RNA sequence: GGGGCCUGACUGCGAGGCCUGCAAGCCGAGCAGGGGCGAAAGCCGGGCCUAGUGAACCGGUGGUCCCGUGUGGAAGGGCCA
RNA sequence: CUGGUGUUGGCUCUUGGUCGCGCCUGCGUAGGAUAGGUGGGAGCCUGUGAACCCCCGCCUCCGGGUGGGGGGGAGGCGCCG
RNA sequence: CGGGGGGAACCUGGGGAACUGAAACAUCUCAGUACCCAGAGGAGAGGAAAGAGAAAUCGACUCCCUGAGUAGCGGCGAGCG
RNA sequence: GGGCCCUUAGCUUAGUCUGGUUAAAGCGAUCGGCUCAUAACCGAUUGGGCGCUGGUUCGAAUCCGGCAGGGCCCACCA
């Protein structure tokens, strides 16, 4: 139709309109990463920076990178969600106005995405 | 004129004319080119309500309009007849 | 502009209901035609004061109407009708089932308010139920002489 | 007139005078700081000189020992430019 | 003279700016083909019925992209290249 | 049962000038003065804190003395206070 | 001195916010046919360091900042 079944049942374990913590999130990464391999946790985040700025990721202001696997303890995935949130907040340009951590969503290589908060 | 509920009437106010840039912003300030006396009248309208048999009407500052129907309500506790919407209005409080 | 209703209207209706409109509408239509009134404390409370007084008023026509449930339903009917064979002599209706039903020991009944139909007029045994909300079931006795 | 380094077209002052109704205007040795040129003595607080200009008020920027309406901070002032 | 409001209410027709969200959109060389970026990335797809054909609608760089439905039936697809 | 009309000033309320001063003049001044009007009374007004404002403070209102030509207001002018 | 509109081959619209791609046009003269003229009347011609110094990227008219050009209006002026 649009998506599969190994993903169609994962949409049942995530609220379409809800923010989560780095605990209930790094935990929900285990049940949505139902792939025959080590699913990868990728924390995607929208930034509050200008794309066509030489002194201020991609050319649309959306950075992202993986920092965990689908088999890593629910607490070992809560160490890099705080370490990847502090790694970025460590490079916010001078004249970069607008909520930097604009939009953060954590998903796996395959499984669905859960919009989580980077401060809890 | 005057509101039959609140007794609001036209007050007197001036008509100040400033010029220049507000010190707040650019600078120097504003200067008054002319002050003039004038009135501010209430926004009063006409309110026709039934109450009893007769009609009855009100010159009431729009702001208080509701207070008109507040009376038309508690007006059903009094004995208002004798063909006279002049005494019925008088009556209302 | 909260406003209690009356004649149920479209996109806003059903008596005693409170739906806010625009002063303009209420002020020059609803109140003028008696199709609603100001949702004032005055009325607004006098609403519930008539909302309960009809629920607790109906809670007496289905409460004392239910004391008649567990009483004259099981304590079956004992009717000594003057029948004979396969067709009684005096059928059976309120004028019968009820009438004598009263005699038994003081049973007050209704003319058609039960499960009435045609007057029995057929010797055998039948059983009907009271009415309504939620009513009580009681039997009959097609006696013979 | 020509050239080689240079920026004293410094900051903090300023004895004592010229001129003068007021307020403006002009000249100024010398002391302190830190400098430039010169081997040195020394010279430099713009230009051979006399014009190239505008009191206060009100505001703008830049700072800064200051004041900040009970207190903290702000708001807005003051002082220097 | 004029806009915004108050007095100022019902009913539909069509419409903008926004944020939600759900879908789509991208066709210079070449490349199987109409490649939005960038990261994840070796597995999903299929009995939530895949390969194949017809009707049908939208977009269209007229090349196709793609949604619905009956039939149908156990096969499509990525690395590699 | 009351009102109506009068009263030399005084009093409160609703309205409210210009000459003049600024050595012109428009903000400002004269001035909430003159005057018109309604009302009160031997007085009228005000009056028991949604106050004052910096004191472990005072404690209705009114009047006189100070505070004080202070604090301030001001084409930071005249002047107002 | 306060801002807010704007900057290619002669003139004067471009394309540029949606880079790895073709800069085209009218006017302008020249050259040819031209007819027994001229708007030529067709034609063929015929050019852009894309203001400039620089950044990113294999790439810049196009996206990255650091300065000027006018034509625009706003407004203030002790």
XYZ file of C-alpha atoms (C1' of nucleotides) in Angstrom:
679
model
C 0.000 0.000 0.000
C 2.552 2.574 1.204
C 4.430 0.740 3.987
C 4.906 -2.889 5.048
C 3.628 -4.963 7.986
C 6.830 -5.109 10.040
C 6.188 -1.359 10.190
C 2.366 -1.448 10.176
C 2.324 -2.971 13.667
C 5.026 -0.605 14.927
C 2.662 2.323 14.294
C 0.584 0.833 17.098
C 3.332 1.344 19.697
C 3.856 5.070 19.055
C 1.524 8.042 19.625
C 1.013 10.096 16.412
C 0.811 13.275 18.515
C 3.005 12.961 21.618
C 6.424 13.969 22.958
C 8.482 11.366 24.842
C 11.543 11.280 27.119
C 15.029 9.833 26.522
C 13.941 6.849 28.631
C 10.582 5.821 27.146
C 12.140 6.603 23.761
C 15.489 4.783 23.972
C 13.233 1.940 25.167
C 10.638 2.083 22.374
C 13.570 1.693 19.971
C 13.657 -2.040 20.745
C 10.081 -2.852 19.671
C 10.039 -0.706 16.507
C 13.380 -2.068 15.289
C 11.904 -5.416 14.222
C 14.370 -6.043 11.368
C 16.272 -9.281 10.713
C 19.416 -7.279 11.479
C 20.740 -4.739 13.969
C 18.429 -1.782 13.345
C 20.164 1.591 13.675
C 18.989 4.412 15.928
C 19.172 7.736 14.092
C 18.295 10.955 15.939
C 17.069 13.388 13.266
C 16.810 17.049 14.235
C 15.703 20.238 12.472
C 17.879 23.275 13.210
C 17.143 26.957 13.575
C 19.862 28.037 11.159
C 20.051 29.582 7.695
C 20.756 27.169 4.782
C 22.420 29.659 2.405
C 24.670 31.095 5.133
C 28.450 30.764 4.818
C 29.005 31.434 8.536
C 25.809 29.906 9.941
C 24.070 19.122 8.095
C 22.565 19.818 4.656
C 21.556 22.857 2.584
C 18.087 22.880 4.194
C 19.168 23.090 7.843
C 18.475 19.484 8.925
C 21.361 17.639 10.630
C 21.344 13.975 11.660
C 23.488 10.973 12.612
C 23.215 7.478 14.200
C 24.262 6.781 17.802
C 22.875 3.379 18.798
C 21.742 -0.097 17.727
C 18.463 -2.035 18.217
C 20.130 -4.425 20.685
C 21.887 -1.811 22.873
C 20.443 -1.561 26.456
C 17.555 0.928 26.964
C 20.011 2.878 29.157
C 23.034 2.769 26.808
C 20.790 4.503 24.251
C 19.981 7.111 26.907
C 23.682 8.016 27.181
C 24.102 9.062 23.538
C 20.731 10.823 23.188
C 22.063 13.199 25.852
C 25.598 13.129 24.424
C 24.391 13.845 20.885
C 22.134 16.618 22.186
C 25.090 18.226 23.982
C 27.488 17.604 21.089
C 25.342 19.748 18.777
C 24.376 22.418 21.334
C 28.158 22.834 21.402
C 28.311 24.263 17.867
C 25.500 26.836 17.684
C 26.745 29.727 15.460
C 26.918 33.335 16.669
C 24.255 34.928 14.484
C 22.004 31.849 14.411
C 18.578 33.077 15.506
C 15.598 30.789 16.007
C 15.031 27.806 18.326
C 18.067 25.663 17.410
C 16.586 22.324 18.542
C 13.606 23.167 16.344
C 12.442 19.620 15.590
C 13.846 16.379 17.007
C 12.586 12.928 15.955
C 14.270 9.609 16.755
C 13.745 6.577 14.514
C 15.625 3.443 13.439
C 16.970 2.444 10.021
C 13.555 0.921 9.292
C 11.061 1.150 12.163
C 8.818 4.264 12.675
C 9.797 7.597 14.254
C 8.784 8.962 17.674
C 9.043 12.736 18.200
C 11.001 13.016 21.437
C 12.193 15.946 23.578
C 15.962 16.718 23.815
C 15.721 18.150 27.357
C 14.062 15.266 29.249
C -27.246 63.392 25.429
C -27.630 61.051 28.429
C -27.822 57.295 29.139
C -30.974 56.253 31.007
C -29.196 53.404 32.821
C -25.702 54.730 33.669
C -26.298 58.453 33.431
C -23.377 58.675 31.023
C -23.230 62.028 29.333
C -20.939 63.807 26.916
C -17.694 64.888 28.548
C -15.301 67.567 27.375
C -11.932 66.701 25.992
C -9.209 68.438 24.067
C -7.884 67.724 20.608
C -4.116 67.727 20.791
C -2.064 67.959 17.584
C 1.516 66.831 17.889
C 4.187 66.842 15.177
C 7.710 65.566 14.778
C 9.407 62.301 15.687
C 8.719 60.823 19.132
C 11.767 61.274 21.366
C 11.002 57.642 22.212
C 12.140 56.755 18.720
C 14.286 58.977 16.514
C 14.706 62.152 18.510
C 14.076 65.809 19.402
C 10.511 65.064 20.362
C 7.046 66.116 19.378
C 5.733 69.646 19.424
C 2.062 70.543 19.884
C 0.690 72.451 16.919
C -2.694 73.092 18.459
C -4.971 72.171 21.342
C -8.703 72.439 20.809
C -11.744 71.924 23.003
C -14.277 69.287 21.975
C -16.815 66.807 23.262
C -16.915 63.065 23.369
C -20.452 61.734 23.336
C -21.566 58.281 24.527
C -22.487 55.680 21.916
C -26.146 55.560 22.857
C -28.772 53.638 20.938
C -32.528 53.047 21.034
C -33.809 49.873 22.713
C -37.462 48.896 22.220
C -38.765 46.137 24.476
C -42.330 44.872 25.122
C -42.721 44.448 28.879
C -46.360 44.205 29.980
C -48.601 45.291 27.129
C -47.271 48.697 26.148
C -43.995 49.044 24.285
C -41.324 51.232 25.989
C -37.965 52.343 24.671
C -34.496 53.258 25.894
C -31.799 55.821 25.039
C -29.072 53.667 26.457
C -25.312 53.839 26.142
C -24.593 50.828 23.966
C -22.064 49.676 26.572
C -24.901 49.014 28.986
C -27.461 47.615 26.543
C -27.650 44.307 28.430
C -28.679 46.002 31.688
C -31.835 46.780 29.740
C -32.909 43.181 29.498
C -31.757 42.612 33.065
C -34.659 44.850 34.051
C -37.119 43.494 31.490
C -36.534 40.214 33.332
C -37.039 41.247 36.950
C -39.889 43.395 35.674
C -42.248 40.429 35.818
C -42.426 40.693 39.602
C -44.164 44.056 39.602
C -47.750 44.902 38.654
C -47.487 46.976 35.487
C -50.768 47.740 33.703
C -52.937 50.825 33.407
C -52.331 51.723 29.747
C -49.194 53.836 30.255
C -45.712 53.086 28.866
C -44.671 56.421 30.395
C -45.345 55.148 33.909
C -43.995 51.692 33.025
C -40.631 53.107 32.024
C -40.687 55.372 35.085
C -41.386 52.266 37.071
C -38.353 50.271 35.924
C -36.266 50.887 39.033
C -23.745 34.771 25.070
C -25.048 31.680 26.828
C -28.720 31.102 26.029
C -31.165 28.445 27.248
C -33.418 27.164 24.480
C -36.955 25.956 23.929
C -38.294 25.083 20.445
C -35.410 22.863 19.279
C -33.635 24.583 16.373
C -31.117 23.602 13.698
C -27.404 23.525 14.570
C -28.609 24.421 18.057
C -31.757 22.937 19.561
C -33.632 20.853 22.139
C -35.337 22.689 24.988
C -33.588 23.874 28.123
C -30.279 23.515 26.290
C -27.642 26.203 26.742
C -25.804 27.243 23.595
C -24.088 30.599 23.232
C -25.139 32.745 20.291
C -24.349 36.296 19.285
C -25.983 39.097 21.265
C -27.469 40.272 17.987
C -29.281 37.022 17.286
C -30.506 36.423 20.816
C -31.327 40.075 21.435
C -33.514 40.587 18.335
C -34.988 37.166 17.502
C -34.732 34.424 20.065
C -35.858 36.428 23.082
C -38.413 38.413 21.017
C -40.174 35.299 19.694
C -39.853 33.314 22.922
C -37.536 30.755 21.346
C -35.073 31.014 24.239
C -34.076 33.151 27.197
C -30.943 34.584 28.821
C -28.791 31.925 30.441
C -28.840 34.029 33.609
C -28.145 32.680 37.088
C -31.789 33.530 37.694
C -32.959 31.060 35.031
C -29.784 28.991 34.614
C -30.186 27.551 38.129
C -33.975 27.385 37.920
C -33.280 25.052 34.997
C -31.528 22.359 36.998
C -34.117 23.071 39.702
C -36.608 21.735 37.153
C -34.224 19.267 35.567
C -33.877 17.300 38.794
C -37.482 17.881 39.823
C -38.512 15.906 36.716
C -35.876 13.192 36.975
C -36.515 12.703 40.706
C -40.184 13.191 39.783
C -39.970 10.401 37.239
C -37.766 8.531 39.734
C -41.005 8.100 41.690
C -43.091 6.784 38.779
C -40.486 4.100 38.241
C -39.562 3.679 41.907
C -42.964 3.342 43.575
C -43.851 1.892 40.172
C -41.228 -0.740 40.953
C -42.489 -1.537 44.446
C -45.319 -3.015 42.371
C -42.719 -5.177 40.644
C -41.419 -7.594 43.282
C -44.888 -7.736 44.840
C -47.739 -8.363 42.385
C -45.672 -10.329 39.875
C -44.602 -13.383 41.879
C -47.658 -13.412 44.165
C -49.440 -14.839 41.091
C -53.056 -14.139 40.119
C -55.849 -16.328 41.560
C -58.888 -15.888 39.308
C -61.987 -18.083 40.018
C -63.594 -17.543 36.570
C -66.903 -19.200 35.665
C -65.636 -21.002 32.561
C -66.371 -24.477 31.226
C -64.479 -26.655 28.695
C -62.768 -24.821 25.789
C -64.499 -21.407 25.918
C -65.220 -19.536 29.178
C -68.483 -17.830 30.178
C -67.365 -14.208 30.568
C -64.045 -13.988 28.704
C -61.343 -12.040 30.564
C -60.139 -8.425 30.432
C -59.458 -5.616 32.911
C -63.161 -5.876 33.701
C -62.209 -9.442 34.596
C -58.473 -10.023 35.146
C -58.218 -6.718 36.981
C -61.685 -6.475 38.517
C -61.484 -9.672 40.552
C -57.709 -9.230 40.607
C -58.601 -6.412 42.990
C -60.773 -8.673 45.158
C -58.009 -11.266 45.676
C -56.514 -9.007 48.376
C -56.572 -5.431 47.086
C -54.941 -5.443 43.639
C -55.338 -2.121 41.764
C -55.179 -2.471 37.977
C -55.616 -0.615 34.678
C -58.183 -0.919 31.821
C -55.684 -1.568 29.020
C -52.379 -0.560 30.647
C -50.861 -4.035 31.111
C -50.772 -6.409 28.148
C -54.467 -6.366 27.264
C -55.819 -7.503 23.897
C -58.993 -9.465 23.213
C -60.960 -10.821 26.219
C -59.452 -14.317 26.757
C -62.651 -16.130 25.737
C -60.822 -19.478 25.522
C -60.363 -21.830 28.501
C -56.752 -22.696 29.189
C -53.934 -20.776 30.838
C -52.270 -17.512 29.875
C -49.742 -15.021 31.260
C -48.911 -11.403 30.371
C -46.783 -8.518 31.714
C -47.330 -5.001 33.114
C -46.021 -1.788 31.488
C -43.894 0.147 31.106
C -40.226 0.922 32.037
C -39.155 -1.801 32.728
C -42.493 -3.411 33.803
C -43.245 -6.600 35.786
C -44.462 -10.063 34.619
C -47.521 -11.717 36.247
C -49.788 -14.714 35.340
C -53.503 -15.657 35.040
C -56.028 -18.365 36.109
C -58.725 -19.556 33.656
C -60.886 -21.207 36.356
C -63.953 -23.427 35.779
C -67.231 -24.183 37.604
C 62.958 72.076 -4.326
C 64.512 66.472 -3.457
C 64.879 62.118 -0.429
C 65.023 58.306 3.948
C 62.760 56.788 8.013
C 58.211 58.394 10.290
C 52.477 60.054 12.455
C 53.619 65.023 18.239
C 46.878 66.236 12.664
C 49.732 62.705 20.996
C 46.972 62.299 26.070
C 47.096 65.035 31.156
C 48.010 70.270 31.852
C 49.681 75.125 31.430
C 53.338 79.809 34.349
C 52.818 84.359 32.020
C 50.787 87.569 28.298
C 48.291 89.814 23.625
C 43.297 91.374 22.496
C 38.862 92.708 25.091
C 32.114 95.840 27.634
C 30.501 90.409 28.089
C 31.593 85.733 25.741
C 34.584 84.614 22.203
C 39.734 85.056 19.683
C 45.315 84.416 19.797
C 50.415 83.162 21.499
C 52.688 80.190 24.940
C 57.844 78.379 27.857
C 57.785 74.510 31.189
C 56.410 69.571 34.325
C 54.361 64.057 33.909
C 53.166 59.817 30.531
C 54.246 57.308 26.370
C 56.558 58.193 21.435
C 59.051 59.929 16.045
C 63.542 61.689 13.524
C 68.841 62.478 14.684
C 75.553 60.465 16.209
C 74.400 64.681 19.079
C 72.891 69.606 20.484
C 68.058 69.126 19.706
C 63.300 69.577 17.081
C 57.636 67.658 16.939
C 50.911 69.265 20.854
C 49.499 69.733 12.110
C 50.430 73.322 7.619
C 55.482 80.649 6.179
C 51.317 83.870 8.571
C 46.460 86.635 8.850
C 39.966 83.840 6.128
C 37.952 78.517 5.435
C 32.808 79.883 10.284
C 28.014 79.348 14.437
C 26.556 80.692 21.898
C 22.865 78.050 24.267
C 18.359 74.676 23.604
C 16.493 69.803 21.790
C 17.924 65.373 20.135
C 21.563 61.004 17.728
C 25.532 57.649 18.244
C 30.215 55.591 21.143
C 31.696 54.640 25.461
C 32.327 55.506 31.318
C 34.774 55.816 38.174
C 28.389 58.424 38.511
C 22.518 58.772 39.942
C 18.769 54.346 39.390
C 12.163 57.027 43.692
C 11.134 50.588 49.713
C 15.343 46.689 47.897
C 17.844 44.014 43.373
C 17.986 44.969 38.320
C 16.147 47.590 34.735
C 13.808 52.465 32.438
C 15.799 57.133 31.932
C 19.273 60.496 33.088
C 24.673 62.578 34.193
C 29.980 62.739 32.800
C 33.679 61.972 28.460
C 33.766 61.763 23.162
C -14.267 62.138 2.088
C -12.409 57.715 4.363
C -10.668 52.615 6.909
C -11.174 50.005 11.744
C -14.604 49.201 15.544
C -19.695 49.638 18.458
C -25.077 49.702 17.483
C -24.580 44.553 13.966
C -28.268 39.431 12.801
C -29.427 34.613 10.254
C -28.099 31.535 5.240
C -25.261 29.797 1.677
C -21.169 30.737 -3.116
C -16.315 31.569 -3.881
C -12.043 32.512 -1.880
C -6.654 34.203 0.574
C -2.479 34.005 4.892
C -1.108 30.771 8.202
C 0.332 26.553 11.493
C -1.371 21.510 12.653
C -1.203 16.959 9.792
C -2.136 13.238 5.356
C -0.593 12.622 1.002
C 2.325 14.029 -3.694
C 5.904 17.052 -6.235
C 11.408 17.060 -8.627
C 12.359 14.395 -16.005
C 20.975 19.077 -18.103
C 25.426 14.829 -19.874
C 25.254 9.623 -19.020
C 22.768 6.198 -16.549
C 18.210 -0.036 -17.393
C 14.786 4.501 -15.619
C 11.336 11.513 -14.564
C 17.572 10.500 -8.786
C 14.838 17.096 -3.955
C 18.703 17.189 -0.318
C 21.604 14.202 3.704
C 21.972 10.176 7.106
C 20.444 5.415 8.408
C 21.275 1.249 5.359
C 21.160 -5.363 3.953
C 16.904 -6.361 3.997
C 11.646 -5.561 3.091
C 8.146 -7.161 -0.201
C 4.183 -11.725 -0.279
C -1.680 -15.636 2.646
C -2.815 -7.130 5.329
C -2.464 -11.732 -1.454
C 3.472 -10.039 -5.190
C 4.592 -11.296 -11.471
C 0.730 -10.398 -15.848
C -3.495 -8.205 -18.661
C -8.234 -4.659 -19.057
C -11.425 -0.623 -17.589
C -10.596 4.088 -15.048
C -8.779 9.142 -12.943
C -4.959 12.761 -12.002
C -0.114 15.113 -13.402
C 2.423 15.438 -17.639
C 9.287 17.928 -20.295
C 3.825 13.440 -24.698
C 8.340 10.312 -21.513
C 5.905 8.371 -18.381
C 4.855 8.913 -12.955
C 0.816 6.957 -10.354
C -4.142 5.881 -7.475
C -8.805 2.676 -7.551
C -11.202 -1.815 -8.992
C -12.147 -7.255 -11.155
C -9.214 -11.106 -12.801
C -5.125 -13.458 -11.377
C -1.428 -16.463 -8.681
C 3.853 -17.620 -5.838
C 6.575 -14.111 -7.679
C 8.796 -9.225 -7.490
C 13.377 -5.915 -5.571
C 18.371 -3.780 -3.459
C 23.828 -4.802 -3.121
C 26.721 -6.202 -6.851
C 26.904 -3.756 -11.669
C -46.508 65.374 52.658
C -42.773 68.407 49.587
C -40.960 71.744 45.283
C -41.346 76.602 42.487
C -39.119 82.534 43.866
C -35.555 85.935 46.519
C -30.723 86.869 49.065
C -24.655 91.734 49.840
C -20.548 88.673 49.711
C -18.875 83.711 50.917
C -19.565 78.135 48.838
C -19.959 73.811 45.390
C -21.057 71.823 40.655
C -21.754 72.190 34.834
C -19.667 75.303 31.089
C -15.529 78.807 30.198
C -12.806 83.767 27.345
C -9.453 87.712 25.476
C -6.687 91.902 26.243
C -1.818 90.828 28.527
C 3.191 88.358 29.473
C 6.603 85.834 26.264
C 9.685 92.968 24.771
C 6.677 89.456 17.298
C 4.075 84.777 17.878
C 1.380 79.643 17.389
C 3.116 75.597 22.534
C 3.161 78.238 27.128
C 1.117 82.713 30.150
C -3.145 85.666 31.689
C -6.361 81.373 34.136
C -9.658 77.421 35.276
C -9.338 84.077 36.357
C -13.756 87.190 34.170
C -18.237 85.687 32.941
C -22.876 82.526 32.022
C -25.589 78.453 34.404
C -27.688 74.996 38.216
C -27.715 74.170 43.275
C -26.585 74.527 48.895
C -26.734 77.100 53.335
C -25.996 79.837 57.538
C -22.114 78.219 55.972
C -20.627 75.176 51.612
C -17.007 71.731 50.462
C -14.314 67.572 52.456
C -14.382 63.372 55.507
C -12.864 57.780 58.407
C -7.903 55.034 53.768
C -8.265 49.994 47.603
C -4.215 56.683 51.881
C 0.705 58.607 52.597
C 5.874 56.653 51.185
C 10.590 54.639 53.422
C 10.330 55.521 59.019
C 10.948 48.569 63.961
C 6.579 55.086 60.352
C 1.949 57.619 60.309
C -3.322 56.770 61.031
C -10.788 60.696 58.697
C -11.514 65.597 56.930
C -10.966 70.778 57.009
C -8.050 75.557 58.397
C -3.520 78.576 59.947
C 2.170 78.329 60.442
C 6.335 75.906 58.381
C 8.251 72.734 54.950
C 9.534 75.999 50.096
C 10.108 79.584 45.786
C 12.383 73.401 47.968
C 11.259 68.839 44.778
C 10.063 69.389 40.079
C 7.354 71.278 35.606
C 9.127 74.576 31.333
C 9.332 76.996 22.907
C 14.040 73.906 30.283
C 11.873 80.567 27.299
C 8.628 83.668 29.776
C 7.299 81.718 33.704
C 4.383 77.693 36.595
C 5.175 75.368 41.333
C 23.034 62.536 8.895
C 16.612 58.377 9.863
C 15.075 54.463 7.151
C 13.093 51.222 2.092
C 12.629 50.454 -2.727
C 17.746 48.845 -6.634
C 21.829 48.068 -9.799
C 23.562 41.991 -17.883
C 26.745 42.564 -25.194
C 24.488 50.903 -26.857
C 19.622 51.580 -24.559
C 16.856 49.468 -21.781
C 13.580 42.696 -19.389
C 16.131 38.373 -18.720
C 17.545 34.051 -16.647
C 19.696 33.936 -10.586
C 15.925 32.742 -4.586
C 14.740 26.060 -7.705
C 24.425 25.815 -8.958
C 26.970 21.145 -11.062
C 23.097 22.415 -18.027
C 22.318 26.103 -23.204
C 23.477 33.383 -21.712
C 18.563 35.188 -25.835
C 16.445 39.301 -27.385
C 14.796 44.049 -29.877
C 16.990 48.510 -30.945
C 22.425 49.837 -32.999
C 26.143 49.577 -37.628
C 28.300 46.418 -41.196
C 27.959 43.124 -45.030
C 25.114 41.088 -48.991
C 20.060 40.963 -52.222
C 18.768 44.303 -53.193
C 14.537 47.729 -56.940
C 15.101 51.987 -61.482
C 14.363 54.345 -53.365
C 13.608 53.963 -49.071
C 10.949 52.775 -43.144
C 16.493 47.508 -44.623
C 11.514 46.450 -47.175
C 14.919 40.033 -46.585
C 19.226 38.413 -45.526
C 23.934 37.389 -43.408
C 26.681 39.177 -40.213
C 28.535 40.610 -36.082
C 29.200 40.827 -28.924
C 28.322 39.739 -22.426
C 35.444 40.391 -17.936
C 27.185 38.760 -16.192
C 30.112 45.892 -10.931
C 34.407 43.730 -7.784
C 37.585 41.623 -4.317
C 37.128 37.273 -2.255
C 34.160 31.756 0.448
C 31.808 27.075 -0.267
C 31.574 23.185 -3.777
C 34.595 18.864 -8.906
C 30.752 23.719 -10.061
C 28.466 29.998 -9.394
C 24.810 35.271 -14.026
C 22.610 31.623 -10.495
C 24.350 30.207 -3.658
C 28.580 33.190 0.538
C 29.748 37.236 2.803
C 33.228 42.872 2.510
C 32.877 47.315 0.464
C 30.047 51.252 -4.467
C 26.464 52.735 -8.801
C 20.915 55.434 -9.572
C 16.206 55.450 -10.351
C 12.099 54.828 -5.303
C 9.727 56.215 -2.072
C 9.116 56.675 3.927
C 10.206 60.118 7.595
C 13.184 64.151 10.841
C 15.717 68.695 10.946
C 18.209 71.756 17.412
